[PDB]
């Protein structure tokens, strides 16, 4: 019951899913052949959340994979746990977008999306009670940031009451791999605010910083960043698949973390994270988890959370632990940092406990906090956008496929209005 | 009891029968030598429907094979299960028609048909209780579309109360193999509406589309199209040869699917159909069968069924399953698609259940729906006919054998009247 379907688009989203599904399968004891080989009874009670049942007793994820080029899905199939995905759900084009947002949203993405919407509708109509959808995509690419966001609007138009999740990677100015990143980032943020019920920003720069400083491993690769993102993704829905002292589905988090409908851009972090050589030194206790949870360097975004004030915060503890300690520590982390918490909403931290810890760990915490410090990312994105747009650089590529500069002006104005009205509440006082 | 005889004409009809009889024999466990080697008792209880009994314990089909040239029947005899056919039933001429309708209906087909009518009369007078006749022929050929349709009128004149089936392949404009297809298609449709109790149109284009998209096999051949047509043919009379929860002979379908005597042109489809590589992924359930059954691409005709409204529909489920699920799913497929069902006749879907599934499959469904979307085929056929006739192209071949242009004008007018009065009920409201 109350299950969700997985939809991913683009190369970055496909690579994120290729590790997210591996993590989920390892958590539920599903072999790469789709056969259950788990140890505990609880591993099968709520498997309908992510997995479907077919004849022969094997399980198949309800994931939908879409891209405008076939290479990435032809590569993910040969990887581990690549056989679980149903071949029918693979939809792809023969041309690609070339990191051009217009091509992936107006000319090419519009004709292809009917086929993927057909299978999306097939998956949603069938399921017992829908909880919602979760979306993984990147804002630094053309086909992803175009087709995914248009699909968001199409899904929202047909299921207005369901919940919608988006895990979005925004292009940081530090590690830049594409010159046209500001254009399709700014165009995508315009559409994303209007339809997504929840959005979670993730930055490659913050992932590299975490890998270099906390884990202290010499050579980070995309596999480590994907693993961290996958652990963070799994931590959110853990209590929906396992029993606990205070169950809290996604809708309950939506109620408690979004004060106003347009303020739904969160930054997350996962604890504990320790190096291989120091994993024996540390002792896992609730104070040790909560001190690392609120650490500024532990956030999955380069945004500095002590440059603003938290509107609200959430924590999803895992493992068996006493609730009194959790509540007193949450109170203590809020009394010692009163300057960084907005004062006109008292008791702005939500907590939840799940009795099933991750495989290999005795305690774990997932942190989701809505803070005013996120304005800095939109500020720098808009700064680069307005630095590049004033000369109409690279504009002809977009304008040759039916798009105009008016949609750029409206997007810039709406993004600046969002930036302004997000900080409006930072200076608000009672 | 209530058995039927098989009559086929032309090359296309002979090739269809060459696989239909193989499928029937494999279903009843009859070896190509006519010896029963089946496993279940039910395989022999109602074998009198299609097979006769001779001395020595072997079985012989009551099929009649006719053509104006001997090549096709001289070739079908050397194929598998070719020895079952009685040599006496083979009737053929020495000249052929050359795809000319006039030659196969006025000059050559008139003299030969006495011999085949003799054996037809021998077969029908003898049988216990006649149910009716089923006819397989093609509308794209001369000898077939002429001699078969004249034989239809001759049979109807002598057995006015029996039921008559015709499985007719109409020439599509996409895959055209003969230039004179519109003439003998239009001439044949004129006679076919006046005498056939039921007609089922089949298109090669739709068969290629199905083979390429659903089965996803690389190289379709006529053997695959024949196999699909044969499975669809067998599915209709399954409950007449096997026990079931709600038996429904051909006459019961005739009562429930034909509202007015001139509206008896159906399009059919068979489910399930899955690729070899995905036959393990799918799980056979009633929802899975019914979602594929009403799929537009699954129809055996290129006509698009969401371009019109169903007057009525029928489904013949196979296998052992609960009736409550079937009824609720039929209700659900009719509540969610109220726009495509005519409103002045409520509850316009007929269902039937047979407890004996096809060999190798646990569940199967045959769909027969009378829809207003079939008008498009007659529209394009008449369009090509009037494009070619206005210049009197190829007319001398037909007019040199006693035919005139008046019979062409009457045929065109009657066909257009049929097209108009078939859509008259589409716009009708209560």
């Amino acid at each position: 019951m109350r299950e969700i379907v997985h939809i991913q688009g683009g190369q970055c989203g496909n690579q994120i899913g290729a590790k997210f599904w591996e993590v989920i399968s390892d958590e539920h004891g599903i072999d790469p052949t789709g056969t259950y080989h788990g140890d505990s009874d609880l591993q099968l009670e709520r498997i309908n959340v992510y997995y479907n049942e077919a004849t022969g007793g094997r399980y198949v994820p309800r994931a939908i994979l879409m891209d405008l080029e076939p290479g990435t899905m032809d590569s993910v199939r040969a990887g581990p746990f690549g056989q679980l995905f149903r071949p029918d759900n693979f939809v792809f084009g023969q041309t690609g977008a070339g990191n051009n947002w217009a091509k992936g949203h107006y000319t090419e993405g519009a004709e292809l999306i009917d086929s993927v919407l057909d299978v999306v509708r097939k998956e949603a109509e069938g399921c017992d009670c829908l909880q919602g959808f979760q979306i993984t995509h990147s804002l630094g690419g053309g086909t992803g940031s175009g087709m995914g966001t248009l699909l968001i609007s199409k899904v929202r138009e047909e299921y207005p009451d369901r919940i919608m999740e988006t895990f979005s990677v925004v292009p940081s100015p530090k590690v830049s791999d594409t010159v046209v990143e500001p254009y399709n980032a700014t165009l995508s943020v315009h559409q994303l605010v209007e339809n997504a019920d929840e959005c979670m920003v993730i930055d490659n720069e913050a992932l590299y910083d975490i890998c270099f400083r906390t884990l202290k491993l010499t050579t980070p690769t995309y596999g480590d960043l994907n693993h961290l993102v996958s652990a963070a993704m799994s931590g959110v829905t853990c209590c929906l698949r396992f029993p606990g002292q205070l169950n809290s589905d996604l809708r309950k988090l939506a109620v408690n973390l979004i004060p106003f409908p347009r303020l739904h851009f969160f930054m997350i972090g996962f604890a504990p994270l320790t190096s291989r050589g120091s994993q024996q030194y540390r002792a896992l206790t609730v104070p040790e988890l909560t001190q690392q949870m609120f650490d500024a360097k532990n956030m999955m975004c380069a945004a500095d959370p002590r440059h603003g004030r938290y509107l609200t915060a959430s924590a999803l503890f895992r493992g068996r632990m006493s609730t009194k300690e959790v509540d007193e520590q949450m109170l203590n982390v809020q009394n010692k940092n009163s300057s960084y918490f907005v004062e006109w909403i008292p008791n702005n931290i939500k907590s939840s406990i799940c009795d099933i810890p991750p495989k290999g760990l005795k305690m774990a915490v997932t942190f989701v906090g809505n803070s005013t410090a996120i304005q800095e990312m939109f500020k720098r994105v808009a700064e680069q956008f307005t630095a590049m747009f004033r000369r109409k650089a690279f504009l002809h590529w977009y304008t040759g496929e039916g798009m105009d500069e008016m949609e750029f002006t409206e997007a810039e104005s709406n993004m600046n209005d969002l930036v302004s009205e997000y900080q409006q509440y930072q200076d608000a006082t009672a | 009891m209530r058995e039927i005889v098989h009559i086929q004409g032309g090359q296309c009809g002979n090739q269809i029968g060459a696989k239909f009889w193989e499928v029937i024999s494999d279903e009843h466990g009859i070896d190509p030598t006519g010896t029963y080697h089946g496993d279940s008792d039910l395989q022999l209880e109602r074998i009198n429907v299609y097979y006769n009994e001779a001395t020595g314990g072997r079985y012989v089909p009551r099929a009649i094979l006719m053509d104006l040239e001997p090549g096709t029947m001289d070739s079908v005899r050397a194929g598998p299960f070719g020895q079952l056919f009685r040599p006496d039933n083979f009737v053929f001429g020495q000249t052929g028609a050359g795809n000319n309708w006039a030659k196969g209906h006025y000059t050559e087909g008139a003299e030969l048909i006495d011999s085949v009518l003799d054996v037809v009369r021998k077969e029908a007078e003898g049988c216990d209780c006649l149910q009716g006749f089923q006819i397989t022929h093609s509308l794209g050929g001369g000898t077939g579309s002429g001699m078969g349709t004249l034989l239809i009128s001759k049979v109807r004149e002598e057995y006015p109360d029996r039921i008559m089936e015709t499985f007719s392949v109409v020439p599509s404009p996409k895959v055209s193999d003969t230039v004179v297809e519109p003439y003998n298609a239009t001439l044949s449709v004129h006679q076919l509406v006046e005498n056939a109790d039921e007609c089922m149109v089949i298109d090669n284009e739709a068969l290629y589309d199905i083979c390429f998209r659903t089965l996803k096999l690389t190289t379709p051949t006529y053997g695959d199209l024949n196999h699909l047509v044969s499975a669809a043919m067998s599915g209709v009379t399954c409950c007449l040869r096997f026990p079931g929860q709600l038996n429904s002979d051909l006459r019961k379908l005739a009562v429930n699917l034909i509202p007015f005597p001139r509206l008896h042109f159906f399009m059919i489809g068979f489910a399930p159909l899955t690729s070899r590589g995905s036959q393990q992924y799918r799980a056979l359930t009633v929802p899975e069968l019914t979602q594929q059954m009403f799929d537009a691409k699954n129809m055996m005709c290129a006509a698009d069924p969401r371009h019109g409204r169903y007057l009525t529909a029928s489904a013949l489920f196979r296998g052992r399953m609960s009736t409550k699920e079937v009824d609720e799913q039929m209700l659900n497929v009719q509540n969610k698609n109220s726009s495509y069902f005519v409103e002045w006749i409520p509850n316009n879907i007929k269902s039937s259940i047979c407890d004996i599934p096809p060999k190798g499959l646990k569940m199967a469904v045959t769909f027969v729906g009378n829809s207003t979307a079939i008008q498009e085929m007659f529209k394009r056929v008449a369009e090509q006919f009037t494009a070619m006739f206005r210049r009197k192209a190829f007319l001398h071949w037909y007019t040199g054998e006693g035919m005139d242009e008046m019979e062409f004008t009457e045929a065109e007018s009657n066909m257009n009247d049929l097209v108009s009065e078939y859509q008259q009920y589409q716009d009708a409201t209560a």
């Binding site: 207005p160 | 509540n335 409103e343």
Partner: protein
Amino acid sequence: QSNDELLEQIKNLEKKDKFWLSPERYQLDLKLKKKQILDRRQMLMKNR
């Protein structure tokens, strides 16, 4: 068509049909629900 016109058509069909669920009534109820969702969305957009 106004929301009141659609409700009056539904009430007039309720007076004409002895059956609580005619196919025509079901289509009008679906039209009414779709419109109330659009009006609610327009009010939520005006309140932003």
